[PDB]
Write a protein that binds this ligand. Structure first.
Ligand SMILES: CCC(=O)NCc1nnc2n1CCCC2
Ligand SMILES: [Zn+2]
Length: 140
């Protein structure tokens, strides 16, 4: 589990979005495994605006943050998981690291702020859903 709280926005994994998220929808993409809902209180997180390929991510199944190198966001085939079938996921970054289903929503951060959240795992990789490209999460 986990979310990004930027301005009046909650960024979550689409597959973990609640009824309240859906009832306060601002934007979803099922190929990006992202959903954004509106908040009443403002959030503490800053979104990275950069093309960094190094950062640190939180792994709840280890209670540990790991420094990782990761690929640039791309369209990638993902094998079946407990929460999605085998499918193409867009805007996905991969690193060598530990990721189980419940690690989804852990932040990846670089020197510039929040890069994305854990979205995939298995076979010794962790996959992150990029948010740097959503410039609107930092704007009105
Ligand atoms: C499909 C890409 C995307 O970002 N859709 C959400 C979105 N597009 N422009 C904006 N937003 C939300 C707030 C208005 C600014
Ligand atoms: Zn950066």
């Amino acid at each position: 589990s986990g979310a990004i709280y930027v301005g009046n926005y909650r960024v979550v994994n689409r597959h973990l979005a609640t009824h309240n998220d859906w009832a306060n929808l601002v934007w979803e993409d099922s190929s990006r495994d992202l959903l954004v809902s509106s908040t009443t209180a403002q959030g503490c997180d800053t979104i990275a605006r950069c093309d960094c390929q190094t950062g640190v991510y939180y792994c709840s199944s280890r209670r540990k943050h790991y420094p990782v190198s990761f690929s640039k966001p791309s369209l990638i085939f993902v094998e079946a998981s407990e929460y999605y079938p085998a499918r193409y996921q867009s805007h996905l970054m991969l690193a060598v690291g530990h990721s189980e289903p419940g690690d989804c929503g852990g932040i990846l951060r670089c020197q510039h702020g929040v890069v994305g959240i854990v979205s995939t795992g298995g076979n010794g990789l962790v996959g992150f859903a990029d948010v740097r490209d959503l410039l609107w999460l930092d704007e009105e």
